[PDB]
Amino acid sequence: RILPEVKVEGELGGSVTIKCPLPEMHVRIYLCREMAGSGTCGTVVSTTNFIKAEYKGRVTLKQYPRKNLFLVEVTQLTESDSGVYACGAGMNTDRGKTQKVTLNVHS
Amino acid sequence: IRVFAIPPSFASIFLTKSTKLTCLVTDLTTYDSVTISWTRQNGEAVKTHTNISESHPNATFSAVGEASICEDDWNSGERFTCTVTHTDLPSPLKQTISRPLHRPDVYLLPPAREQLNLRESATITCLVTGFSPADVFVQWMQRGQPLSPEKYVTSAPMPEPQAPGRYFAHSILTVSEEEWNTGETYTCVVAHEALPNRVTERTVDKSTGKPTLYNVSLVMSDTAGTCY
Amino acid sequence: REQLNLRESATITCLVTGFSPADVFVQWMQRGQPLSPEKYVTSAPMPEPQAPGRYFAHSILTVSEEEWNTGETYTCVVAHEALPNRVTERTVDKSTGKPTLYNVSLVMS
Amino acid sequence: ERIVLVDNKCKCARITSRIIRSSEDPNEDIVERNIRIIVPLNNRENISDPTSPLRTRFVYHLSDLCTCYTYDRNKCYTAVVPLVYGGETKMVETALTPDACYP
Numbered sequence: 001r002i003l004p005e006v007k008v009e010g011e012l013g014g015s016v017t018i019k020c021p022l023p024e025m026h027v028r029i030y031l032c033r034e035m036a037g038s039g040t041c042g043t044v045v046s047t048t049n050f051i052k053a054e055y056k057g058r059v060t061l062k063q064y065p066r067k068n069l070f071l072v073e074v075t076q077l078t079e080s081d082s083g084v085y086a087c088g089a090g091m092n093t094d095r096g097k098t099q100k101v102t103l104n105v106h107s
Numbered sequence: 108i109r110v111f112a113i114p115p116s117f118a119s120i121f122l123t124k125s126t127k128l129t130c131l132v133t134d135l136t137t138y139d140s141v142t143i144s145w146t147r148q149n150g151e152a153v154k155t156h157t158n159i160s161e162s163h164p165n166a167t168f169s170a171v172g173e174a175s176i177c178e179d180d181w182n183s184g185e186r187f188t189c190t191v192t193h194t195d196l197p198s199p200l201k202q203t204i205s206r207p208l209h210r211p212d213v214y215l216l217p218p219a220r221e222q223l224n225l226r227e228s229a230t231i232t233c234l235v236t237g238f239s240p241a242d243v244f245v246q247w248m249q250r251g252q253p254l255s256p257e258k259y260v261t262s263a264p265m266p267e268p269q270a271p272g273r274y275f276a277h278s279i280l281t282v283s284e285e286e287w288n289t290g291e292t293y294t295c296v297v298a299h300e301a302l303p304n305r306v307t308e309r310t311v312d313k314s315t316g317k318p319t320l321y322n323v324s325l326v327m328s329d330t331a332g333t334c335y
Numbered sequence: 336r337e338q339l340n341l342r343e344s345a346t347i348t349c350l351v352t353g354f355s356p357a358d359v360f361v362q363w364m365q366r367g368q369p370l371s372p373e374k375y376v377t378s379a380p381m382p383e384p385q386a387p388g389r390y391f392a393h394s395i396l397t398v399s400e401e402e403w404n405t406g407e408t409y410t411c412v413v414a415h416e417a418l419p420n421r422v423t424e425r426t427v428d429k430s431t432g433k434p435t436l437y438n439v440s441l442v443m444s
Numbered sequence: 445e446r447i448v449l450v451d452n453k454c455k456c457a458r459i460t461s462r463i464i465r466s467s468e469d470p471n472e473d474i475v476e477r478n479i480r481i482i483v484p485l486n487n488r489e490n491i492s493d494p495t496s497p498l499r500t501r502f503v504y505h506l507s508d509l510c511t512c513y514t515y516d517r518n519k520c521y522t523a524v525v526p527l528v529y530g531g532e533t534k535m536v537e538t539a540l541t542p543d544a545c546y547p
């Protein structure tokens with residue numbers, strides 16, 4: 001259970017990529033934005049071709065088996081992308097998260 | 108005239124692994140140049156005996172003899188006899204000492220709540236019950252560091268009331284009250300012949316014992332079907 | 336607790352420490368009448384490892400494991416010539432510890 | 445701060461304990477027992493054969509807590525499924541837990 005909250009800055013032009021651990025056994029690896037009001041977790045990026053409706057076409061998945069870092073990148077920032085993005089595995093999304101971190105706008 | 112012979116004890120074979128028969132002859136007449144020997148049942152001799160004490164304060168001579176044998180020479184039932192002679196009785200006086208089952212559990216009782224309210228000294232007690240035969244050992248270790256007998260004591264081994272099968276012994280340790288704000292877990296280690304490794308280390312601290320608040324938090328989910 | 340899970344017997348120890356001089360006497364009462372000498376065993380006084388001129392003792396009462404299970408007091412009475420009335424006693428029960436308040440948090444969500 | 449006293453993963457009990465640091469008073473401390481059983485509520489009688497009645501009883505003796513209810517995430521559970529495709533019957537090993545183990 002890792003909690004590496006980083007302060008990577010963002011903007012419209014700006015791009016921030018998160019780093020995540022991979023089991024490398026070709027399971028379901030996902031990044032999920034937790035919703036405070038909902039109390040559940042909503043997958044923003046998954047192993048399959050699913051992408052969140054708000055994040056359609058502005059996100060990229062980048063997997064290296066060589067270096068054991070699982071990383072996802074966001075092309076543009078609307079400044080609303082401030083929340084607990086947690087990575088993970090297994091079919092489940094909520095109860096399967098491995099590491100969580102909250103990104104940030106401006107700085 | 109006083110002659111005795113003692114076999115090795117379990118407080119030396121575990122502490123040093125130096126099993127040896129001893130022969131103590133004292134309160135005889137003051138005449139030196141005496142001979143001491145140890146003879147087995149087969150006809151094997153022993154090693155030399157030295158380190159004789161000085162004359163007793165009440166004007167008599169002492170004498171000590173040692174029989175250093177192998178470890179298996181005492182667990183295989185070999186009788187040993189101590190030859191000691193004197194200037195007055197021409198016959199060589201001889202003495203024979205011979206031989207010694209259940210394995211019983213250690214139990215560590217924590218100090219009572221009333222004793223801790225005095226803020227002076229809590230005594231931890233270690234009960235070794237149901238063990239046969241006697242001479243069972245005990246040692247206290249604080250954080251894995253050996254505890255000397257200056258700060259602990261053991262009941263000399265004893266007998267049971269309803270069953271005569273195994274006998275009991277006890278050990279109590281003394282400390283302060285500030286020590287029971289950190290614990291150090293005060294392990295009680297034992298050494299008895301009816302043990303695999305001759306060690307049954309047990310330890311109890313404040314974390315274990317009787318707790319004063321349970322909150323079970325059983326949850327029920329319809330999708331936690333593989334307890335991650 | 337470890338000794339009661341063997342479901343064979345229960346072992347209560349009356350610890351008499353800090354008295355002086357020697358020759359302390361211990362008996363085991365139950366509901367007023369004493370217990371037989373074959374039910375309890377008393378050790379001889381031994382000096383205190385730190386305290387120079389004091390002593391200690393012990394008194395083990397062993398009973399059937401089930402008998403401890405239903406109330407049943409077992410009070411230990413100690414007579415020594417230094418007590419204010421020359422007689423003192425203590426008692427325990429199955430219920431002799433504390434409140435042990437449960438704090439259940441059943442969840443159905 | 446809590447010692448992991450039990451981390452059972454086949455019945456999912458997660459018993460633990462700690463000492464609560466109260467005020468600087470006489471040592472009327474409190475020892476904790478945070479037992480946390482999780483109920484599957486949807487598993488079967490045998491954990492490895494989906495043909496039995498589902499699950500009514502949930503027995504937790506905490507002395508045998510150091511047949512199961514849940515599935516170990518790092519373990520693999522499989523079965524033989526009797527498929528046919530015509531006349532032949534290649535009884536092939538299926539997977540009751542896709543993703544905890546791979547061929």
Ligand SMILES: *[C@@H]1O[C@H](CO)[C@@H](O)[C@H](O)[C@H]1NC(C)=O
Nearest residue numbers: 320322323324438440476478
């Ligand atoms: C159990 O009690 C402790 C303190 O008494 C508390 O910190 C903990 O949150 C409780 N457990 C649950 C599941 O609420």
Ligand SMILES: *[C@@H]1O[C@H](CO)[C@@H](O)[C@H](O)[C@H]1NC(C)=O
Nearest residue numbers: 320322323324438439440441
């Ligand atoms: C247990 O009690 C503590 C304080 O005594 C409380 O904070 C906690 O919420 C309780 N656990 C529950 C209700 O699950």
Ligand SMILES: *[C@@H]1O[C@H](CO)[C@@H](O)[C@H](O)[C@H]1NC(C)=O
Nearest residue numbers: 489490491492493494496523
């Ligand atoms: C149902 O449970 C039994 C009992 O252990 C075991 O053989 C298996 O999990 C199940 N039976 C079969 C035939 O799969």
